[PDB]
Write a protein that binds this DNA or RNA. Structure first.
Ligand SMILES: [Zn+2]
Length: 252
DNA sequence: GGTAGATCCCGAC
DNA sequence: CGGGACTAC
């Protein structure tokens, strides 16, 4: 799920778990647990804590408990569900939080790609994976000025820049390509080559693109198909080590 | 330090 | 091979 979907999960999941107390934590794929390193310590420490809140930073979910925070990333295919302990688990369920009321928060992931970190609340923001995370794209902290400053200092492409979690939080591959199209900027352009005008335009489209989604596609996955603005076939290449989609007429 | 690379996964070509 | 977010040049 992308940032907008994660925000939706945050909003919808909260009332389903707030105020519930953890009675057990069952782990069927220990590698998901990244901290504490020992999955048995992870499970042991959460038992007895009550869920108090649920926040989002980038694409990370931060479950707030009594003493600890659980930081969770779903990557591409991870999913949470709240359901009864009396029913069979769905396929590819890797971690289950059992509540004293007989309900469960279950983490599924066909790809087994997600991660979980638990720390005392007060430590979470200064430890991985939240440490170094850039500003929210929808916050005033993410500004043309901030973007311009990172752009001038690097030799990387503008796409590589936008994908950098330290530059801006949780801006995924799809929104990078879409924003660059809407801004009229080629993804392979050196970040430092962007004029002041292009930076302002890019920031504007990044906010608009992600903002609209939080509340169709022009290029992503549309290779070989006509651009919706000019009719030129959308092309796909590899930039910054990822599938990259663009219109060679609209973007310069 | 800045940056590319290696790392984890497995359904689907 | 597709993605997102510790190691070594
Ligand atoms: Zn076009």
């Amino acid at each position: 799920p992308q940032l907008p979907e994660v925000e939706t999960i945050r909003r919808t999941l909260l009332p389903l778990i707030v105020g519930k107390t953890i009675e057990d934590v069952r782990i069927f794929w220990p590698n998901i647990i990244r901290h504490p390193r020992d999955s048995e310590a992870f499970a042991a420490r959460m038992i007895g804590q009550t869920v108090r809140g649920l926040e989002r930073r980038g694409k990370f979910l931060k479950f707030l408990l009594d003493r600890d925070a659980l930081i969770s990333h779903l990557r591409m295919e991870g999913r949470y569900a709240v359901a009864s302990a009396l029913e069979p688990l769905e396929p590819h369920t890797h971690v289950v939080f059992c509540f004293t009321d007989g309900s469960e928060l279950r983490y599924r992931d066909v790809r087994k790609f997600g991660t979980m970190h638990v720390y005392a609340k007060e430590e979470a923001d200064r430890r991985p994976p939240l440490a170094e995370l850039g500003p929210e794209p929808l916050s005033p902290a993410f500004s043309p000025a901030v973007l311009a400053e990172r752009a001038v200092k690097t030799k990387r492409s503008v796409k590589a820049l936008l994908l950098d979690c330290t530059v801006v939080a949780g801006f995924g591959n799809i929104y990078v390509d879409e924003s660059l199209f809407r801004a009229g900027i080629l993804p392979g352009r050196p970040a430092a080559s962007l004029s002041s005008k292009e930076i302002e335009r890019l920031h504007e489209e990044m906010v608009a693109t992600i903002g609209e989604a939080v509340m169709h596609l022009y290029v992503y996955g549309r290779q070989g198909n006509p651009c919706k603005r000019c009719g030129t076939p959308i092309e796909k290449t590899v930039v910054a080590g990822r599938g990259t989609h663009y219109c060679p007429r609209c973007q310069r």
